GROMACS .gro file of C-alpha atoms in nm:
model
  183
    1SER     CA    1   1.169  13.577  12.668
    2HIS     CA    2   1.145  13.766  12.313
    3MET     CA    3   1.025  13.514  12.041
    4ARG     CA    4   1.296  13.476  11.772
    5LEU     CA    5   1.077  13.370  11.447
    6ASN     CA    6   1.309  13.105  11.276
    7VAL     CA    7   1.256  13.077  10.921
    8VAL     CA    8   1.354  12.719  10.769
    9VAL     CA    9   1.411  12.739  10.374
   10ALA     CA   10   1.625  12.570  10.135
   11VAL     CA   11   1.706  12.841   9.815
   12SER     CA   12   1.824  12.785   9.452
   13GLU     CA   13   2.139  13.030   9.357
   14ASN     CA   14   1.902  13.347   9.311
   15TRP     CA   15   1.663  13.231   9.606
   16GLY     CA   16   1.436  13.077   9.458
   17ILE     CA   17   1.259  12.870   9.706
   18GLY     CA   18   1.367  12.484   9.719
   19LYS     CA   19   1.045  12.329   9.676
   20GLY     CA   20   0.806  12.103   9.409
   21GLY     CA   21   0.875  11.736   9.369
   22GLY     CA   22   1.005  11.567   9.651
   23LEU     CA   23   1.190  11.884   9.778
   24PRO     CA   24   1.284  11.971  10.026
   25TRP     CA   25   1.185  11.634  10.176
   26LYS     CA   26   1.403  11.385   9.939
   27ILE     CA   27   1.753  11.551  10.003
   28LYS     CA   28   1.826  11.268  10.311
   29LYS     CA   29   2.111  11.519  10.450
   30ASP     CA   30   1.884  11.826  10.437
   31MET     CA   31   1.616  11.626  10.651
   32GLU     CA   32   1.896  11.531  10.940
   33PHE     CA   33   1.969  11.934  10.923
   34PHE     CA   34   1.547  12.004  10.913
   35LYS     CA   35   1.521  11.740  11.176
   36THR     CA   36   1.773  11.865  11.428
   37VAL     CA   37   1.746  12.253  11.390
   38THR     CA   38   1.330  12.193  11.439
   39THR     CA   39   1.354  11.929  11.706
   40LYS     CA   40   1.609  12.024  11.928
   41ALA     CA   41   1.446  12.192  12.227
   42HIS     CA   42   1.576  12.303  12.630
   43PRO     CA   43   1.435  11.997  12.773
   44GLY     CA   44   1.035  11.968  12.875
   45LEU     CA   45   0.961  12.191  12.585
   46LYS     CA   46   0.886  12.152  12.209
   47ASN     CA   47   0.964  12.376  11.896
   48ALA     CA   48   0.645  12.515  11.703
   49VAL     CA   49   0.691  12.394  11.294
   50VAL     CA   50   0.428  12.638  11.145
   51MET     CA   51   0.367  12.601  10.769
   52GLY     CA   52   0.109  12.663  10.497
   53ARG     CA   53  -0.114  12.382  10.388
   54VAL     CA   54   0.092  12.324  10.035
   55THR     CA   55   0.381  12.312  10.266
   56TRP     CA   56   0.160  12.048  10.464
   57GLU     CA   57   0.045  11.869  10.222
   58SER     CA   58   0.353  11.877  10.010
   59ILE     CA   59   0.532  11.615  10.346
   60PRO     CA   60   0.543  11.271  10.271
   61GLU     CA   61   0.311  11.036  10.478
   62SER     CA   62   0.620  10.843  10.661
   63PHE     CA   63   0.694  11.202  10.762
   64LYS     CA   64   0.313  11.346  10.897
   65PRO     CA   65   0.269  11.490  11.145
   66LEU     CA   66   0.648  11.612  11.218
   67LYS     CA   67   0.722  11.434  11.597
   68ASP     CA   68   0.817  11.572  11.887
   69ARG     CA   69   0.672  11.938  11.725
   70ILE     CA   70   0.371  12.134  11.753
   71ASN     CA   71   0.275  12.143  11.426
   72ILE     CA   72   0.048  12.463  11.338
   73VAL     CA   73  -0.097  12.496  10.987
   74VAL     CA   74  -0.196  12.839  10.885
   75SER     CA   75  -0.481  12.742  10.629
   76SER     CA   76  -0.872  12.868  10.584
   77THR     CA   77  -0.955  12.549  10.359
   78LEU     CA   78  -0.819  12.255  10.585
   79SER     CA   79  -1.069  12.143  10.742
   80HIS     CA   80  -0.963  11.827  10.939
   81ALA     CA   81  -0.618  11.781  11.046
   82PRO     CA   82  -0.471  11.444  11.254
   83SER     CA   83  -0.470  11.464  11.611
   84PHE     CA   84  -0.295  11.752  11.803
   85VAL     CA   85  -0.183  11.881  11.453
   86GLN     CA   86  -0.381  12.304  11.491
   87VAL     CA   87  -0.525  12.456  11.211
   88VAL     CA   88  -0.567  12.863  11.216
   89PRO     CA   89  -0.678  13.116  11.017
   90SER     CA   90  -0.354  13.325  11.025
   91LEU     CA   91   0.039  13.376  11.133
   92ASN     CA   92  -0.150  13.597  11.392
   93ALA     CA   93  -0.343  13.354  11.532
   94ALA     CA   94  -0.072  13.084  11.494
   95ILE     CA   95   0.136  13.296  11.739
   96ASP     CA   96  -0.156  13.421  12.002
   97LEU     CA   97  -0.210  12.978  11.985
   98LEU     CA   98   0.147  12.939  12.055
   99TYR     CA   99   0.079  13.223  12.361
  100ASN     CA  100  -0.257  13.079  12.505
  101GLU     CA  101  -0.310  12.886  12.816
  102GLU     CA  102  -0.274  12.565  12.581
  103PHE     CA  103   0.114  12.567  12.476
  104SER     CA  104   0.244  12.854  12.632
  105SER     CA  105   0.412  12.623  12.914
  106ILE     CA  106   0.520  12.391  12.646
  107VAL     CA  107   0.665  12.599  12.357
  108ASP     CA  108   1.044  12.681  12.322
  109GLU     CA  109   1.110  12.786  11.974
  110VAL     CA  110   0.917  12.860  11.693
  111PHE     CA  111   0.997  12.795  11.331
  112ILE     CA  112   0.798  12.882  11.005
  113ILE     CA  113   0.877  12.611  10.772
  114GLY     CA  114   0.718  12.741  10.488
  115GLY     CA  115   0.468  12.911  10.265
  116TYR     CA  116   0.588  13.166  10.034
  117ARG     CA  117   0.307  13.382  10.243
  118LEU     CA  118   0.432  13.295  10.577
  119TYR     CA  119   0.791  13.346  10.455
  120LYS     CA  120   0.659  13.700  10.359
  121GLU     CA  121   0.474  13.795  10.681
  122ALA     CA  122   0.748  13.674  10.851
  123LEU     CA  123   1.010  13.876  10.673
  124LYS     CA  124   0.841  14.166  10.623
  125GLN     CA  125   0.688  14.263  11.013
  126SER     CA  126   0.923  14.499  11.203
  127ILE     CA  127   0.868  14.342  11.570
  128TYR     CA  128   1.039  14.073  11.638
  129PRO     CA  129   1.390  13.959  11.547
  130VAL     CA  130   1.447  13.671  11.256
  131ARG     CA  131   1.670  13.422  11.188
  132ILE     CA  132   1.685  13.204  10.890
  133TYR     CA  133   1.853  12.876  10.873
  134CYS     CA  134   1.895  12.821  10.483
  135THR     CA  135   1.994  12.550  10.296
  136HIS     CA  136   2.171  12.659   9.990
  137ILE     CA  137   2.107  12.463   9.654
  138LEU     CA  138   2.288  12.450   9.308
  139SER     CA  139   1.954  12.317   9.124
  140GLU     CA  140   2.017  12.121   8.837
  141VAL     CA  141   1.647  12.184   8.751
  142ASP     CA  142   1.518  12.566   8.821
  143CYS     CA  143   1.295  12.708   9.127
  144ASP     CA  144   1.089  12.957   8.972
  145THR     CA  145   0.893  13.083   9.319
  146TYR     CA  146   1.118  13.324   9.510
  147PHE     CA  147   1.197  13.389   9.868
  148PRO     CA  148   1.083  13.719   9.961
  149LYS     CA  149   1.341  14.007   9.934
  150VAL     CA  150   1.654  13.984  10.178
  151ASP     CA  151   1.955  14.249  10.221
  152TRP     CA  152   2.195  13.914  10.199
  153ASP     CA  153   2.457  14.162  10.264
  154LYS     CA  154   2.373  14.251  10.570
  155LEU     CA  155   2.252  13.900  10.696
  156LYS     CA  156   2.502  13.818  10.979
  157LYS     CA  157   2.632  13.491  10.941
  158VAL     CA  158   2.621  13.234  11.234
  159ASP     CA  159   2.874  12.995  11.391
  160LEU     CA  160   2.683  12.699  11.515
  161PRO     CA  161   2.882  12.418  11.630
  162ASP     CA  162   2.636  12.075  11.558
  163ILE     CA  163   2.603  12.245  11.192
  164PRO     CA  164   2.876  12.090  10.986
  165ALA     CA  165   3.008  12.410  10.690
  166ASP     CA  166   3.115  12.125  10.428
  167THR     CA  167   2.912  12.166  10.051
  168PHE     CA  168   2.745  11.838  10.060
  169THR     CA  169   2.646  11.665   9.715
  170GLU     CA  170   2.330  11.383   9.683
  171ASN     CA  171   2.145  11.300   9.404
  172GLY     CA  172   2.178  11.626   9.138
  173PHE     CA  173   2.220  11.783   9.432
  174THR     CA  174   2.465  12.066   9.588
  175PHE     CA  175   2.425  12.214   9.859
  176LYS     CA  176   2.590  12.356  10.199
  177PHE     CA  177   2.415  12.493  10.528
  178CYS     CA  178   2.382  12.837  10.651
  179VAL     CA  179   2.236  13.049  10.964
  180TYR     CA  180   2.172  13.398  10.962
  181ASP     CA  181   2.085  13.699  11.136
  182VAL     CA  182   1.887  13.966  11.016
  183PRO     CA  183   1.968  14.254  11.164
   0.00000   0.00000   0.00000
Protein backbone atom coordinates (compact mmCIF):
# COMPACT_ATOMS: atom_id res chain seq x y z
CA SER A 1 0.00 0.00 0.00
CA HIS A 2 2.13 2.84 1.41
CA MET A 3 5.79 1.84 1.43
CA ARG A 4 7.59 1.69 4.77
CA LEU A 5 11.35 1.74 4.32
CA ASN A 6 12.85 -0.89 6.54
CA VAL A 7 16.41 -0.29 7.63
CA VAL A 8 18.42 -3.26 8.92
CA VAL A 9 21.67 -2.45 10.73
CA ALA A 10 23.99 -3.61 13.54
CA VAL A 11 25.26 -0.84 15.80
CA SER A 12 27.74 -0.51 18.67
CA GLU A 13 27.22 1.46 21.92
CA ASN A 14 27.53 4.79 20.11
CA TRP A 15 25.64 3.72 17.01
CA GLY A 16 28.93 2.96 15.24
CA ILE A 17 27.97 0.73 12.26
CA GLY A 18 28.59 -3.03 12.70
CA LYS A 19 30.69 -3.71 9.59
CA GLY A 20 34.26 -4.72 8.75
CA GLY A 21 35.89 -8.09 9.40
CA GLY A 22 33.12 -10.67 9.20
CA LEU A 23 30.46 -8.28 10.52
CA PRO A 24 27.58 -8.77 10.65
CA TRP A 25 27.56 -12.00 8.56
CA LYS A 26 29.81 -13.89 10.98
CA ILE A 27 27.52 -13.68 14.02
CA LYS A 28 25.29 -16.74 13.51
CA LYS A 29 22.49 -15.54 15.74
CA ASP A 30 22.43 -12.20 13.92
CA MET A 31 22.15 -14.01 10.58
CA GLU A 32 19.11 -15.95 11.80
CA PHE A 33 17.57 -12.57 12.77
CA PHE A 34 18.62 -11.07 9.45
CA LYS A 35 17.33 -14.04 7.40
CA THR A 36 13.97 -14.08 9.20
CA VAL A 37 13.41 -10.29 9.10
CA THR A 38 14.32 -9.98 5.44
CA THR A 39 12.85 -13.15 4.02
CA LYS A 40 9.48 -13.37 5.70
CA ALA A 41 6.84 -12.12 3.29
CA HIS A 42 3.15 -12.62 2.61
CA PRO A 43 2.63 -15.79 0.52
CA GLY A 44 3.45 -15.55 -3.19
CA LEU A 45 5.59 -12.44 -2.63
CA LYS A 46 9.25 -11.60 -1.98
CA ASN A 47 10.85 -8.85 0.02
CA ALA A 48 13.54 -6.65 -1.60
CA VAL A 49 16.94 -6.13 0.03
CA VAL A 50 18.63 -3.00 -1.23
CA MET A 51 22.31 -2.35 -0.51
CA GLY A 52 25.47 -0.53 -1.72
CA ARG A 53 28.31 -2.33 -3.52
CA VAL A 54 30.61 -2.59 -0.54
CA THR A 55 27.80 -4.21 1.42
CA TRP A 56 27.21 -6.53 -1.54
CA GLU A 57 30.93 -7.33 -1.77
CA SER A 58 31.29 -7.97 1.95
CA ILE A 59 28.79 -10.82 1.86
CA PRO A 60 30.43 -14.28 1.83
CA GLU A 61 30.00 -16.23 -1.41
CA SER A 62 28.07 -19.08 0.22
CA PHE A 63 25.47 -16.40 1.08
CA LYS A 64 25.16 -14.48 -2.23
CA PRO A 65 22.63 -13.63 -3.81
CA LEU A 66 20.32 -13.70 -0.80
CA LYS A 67 17.82 -16.45 -1.62
CA ASP A 68 14.07 -15.72 -1.82
CA ARG A 69 14.58 -11.96 -1.92
CA ILE A 70 14.89 -9.53 -4.76
CA ASN A 71 18.52 -8.37 -4.51
CA ILE A 72 19.25 -4.82 -5.63
CA VAL A 73 22.67 -3.20 -5.45
CA VAL A 74 22.90 0.60 -5.73
CA SER A 75 26.18 1.21 -7.54
CA SER A 76 27.55 2.92 -10.67
CA THR A 77 30.65 0.70 -10.61
CA LEU A 78 29.31 -2.84 -10.44
CA SER A 79 29.47 -3.81 -14.07
CA HIS A 80 27.94 -7.25 -13.80
CA ALA A 81 25.82 -9.21 -11.36
CA PRO A 82 24.71 -12.82 -10.86
CA SER A 83 21.49 -13.73 -12.66
CA PHE A 84 18.52 -11.79 -11.29
CA VAL A 85 20.53 -9.49 -9.07
CA GLN A 86 19.60 -5.89 -10.04
CA VAL A 87 22.14 -3.08 -10.23
CA VAL A 88 20.87 0.53 -10.31
CA PRO A 89 22.68 3.89 -9.91
CA SER A 90 20.56 5.27 -7.08
CA LEU A 91 18.08 4.55 -4.30
CA ASN A 92 15.54 6.51 -6.36
CA ALA A 93 16.09 4.03 -9.09
CA ALA A 94 15.83 0.98 -6.78
CA ILE A 95 12.39 2.16 -5.59
CA ASP A 96 11.19 2.94 -9.11
CA LEU A 97 12.38 -0.48 -10.20
CA LEU A 98 10.38 -2.15 -7.37
CA TYR A 99 7.33 -0.27 -8.48
CA ASN A 100 7.90 -1.07 -12.17
CA GLU A 101 6.09 -3.80 -14.08
CA GLU A 102 8.85 -6.31 -13.52
CA PHE A 103 8.62 -6.27 -9.71
CA SER A 104 5.44 -4.52 -8.59
CA SER A 105 3.40 -7.74 -8.56
CA ILE A 106 6.18 -9.53 -6.65
CA VAL A 107 7.55 -7.18 -3.96
CA ASP A 108 6.25 -7.23 -0.42
CA GLU A 109 8.50 -5.16 1.89
CA VAL A 110 11.71 -3.23 1.14
CA PHE A 111 14.77 -3.52 3.41
CA ILE A 112 17.82 -1.26 3.14
CA ILE A 113 20.69 -3.35 4.51
CA GLY A 114 23.46 -0.93 4.30
CA GLY A 115 25.66 1.44 2.90
CA TYR A 116 26.09 4.37 5.22
CA ARG A 117 24.99 6.43 2.16
CA LEU A 118 21.79 4.38 1.75
CA TYR A 119 20.98 4.48 5.43
CA LYS A 120 21.53 8.19 5.29
CA GLU A 121 19.21 8.72 2.31
CA ALA A 122 16.61 6.44 3.84
CA LEU A 123 16.62 8.32 7.14
CA LYS A 124 16.83 11.83 5.66
CA GLN A 125 13.78 11.59 3.29
CA SER A 126 10.49 12.98 4.62
CA ILE A 127 8.05 11.02 2.44
CA TYR A 128 7.99 7.41 3.66
CA PRO A 129 7.86 6.16 7.30
CA VAL A 130 10.96 4.25 8.38
CA ARG A 131 11.33 1.21 10.63
CA ILE A 132 14.74 0.18 11.94
CA TYR A 133 15.57 -3.43 12.79
CA CYS A 134 18.58 -2.97 14.95
CA THR A 135 21.13 -5.34 16.42
CA HIS A 136 22.76 -3.56 19.34
CA ILE A 137 26.24 -4.84 20.08
CA LEU A 138 28.74 -4.30 22.87
CA SER A 139 31.83 -4.00 20.77
CA GLU A 140 34.99 -5.66 22.04
CA VAL A 141 36.59 -3.60 19.22
CA ASP A 142 35.64 -0.15 17.93
CA CYS A 143 33.15 0.48 15.12
CA ASP A 144 34.33 3.78 13.62
CA THR A 145 31.93 4.50 10.72
CA TYR A 146 28.74 5.96 12.19
CA PHE A 147 25.08 5.45 11.66
CA PRO A 148 23.25 8.62 10.50
CA LYS A 149 21.82 10.83 13.25
CA VAL A 150 18.53 9.59 14.71
CA ASP A 151 16.79 10.90 17.85
CA TRP A 152 16.63 7.52 19.62
CA ASP A 153 14.77 9.12 22.52
CA LYS A 154 11.77 9.48 20.19
CA LEU A 155 12.06 6.05 18.53
CA LYS A 156 8.97 3.96 19.22
CA LYS A 157 9.99 0.50 20.36
CA VAL A 158 8.03 -2.22 18.58
CA ASP A 159 7.07 -5.56 20.13
CA LEU A 160 7.18 -8.47 17.66
CA PRO A 161 6.52 -12.05 18.82
CA ASP A 162 9.10 -13.88 16.70
CA ILE A 163 11.81 -11.54 18.02
CA PRO A 164 13.51 -12.73 21.21
CA ALA A 165 14.18 -9.89 23.60
CA ASP A 166 17.03 -11.55 25.48
CA THR A 167 20.69 -10.50 25.36
CA PHE A 168 22.94 -12.99 23.51
CA THR A 169 26.68 -13.72 23.65
CA GLU A 170 28.50 -15.22 20.69
CA ASN A 171 32.25 -15.00 20.19
CA GLY A 172 33.42 -11.76 21.74
CA PHE A 173 30.02 -10.23 21.02
CA THR A 174 27.12 -9.48 23.29
CA PHE A 175 24.00 -8.22 21.51
CA LYS A 176 20.27 -7.83 21.53
CA PHE A 177 17.62 -7.23 18.90
CA CYS A 178 15.35 -4.20 18.89
CA VAL A 179 12.84 -2.86 16.39
CA TYR A 180 11.93 0.82 16.13
CA ASP A 181 9.41 2.95 14.31
CA VAL A 182 10.69 6.42 13.56
CA PRO A 183 7.82 8.80 14.30
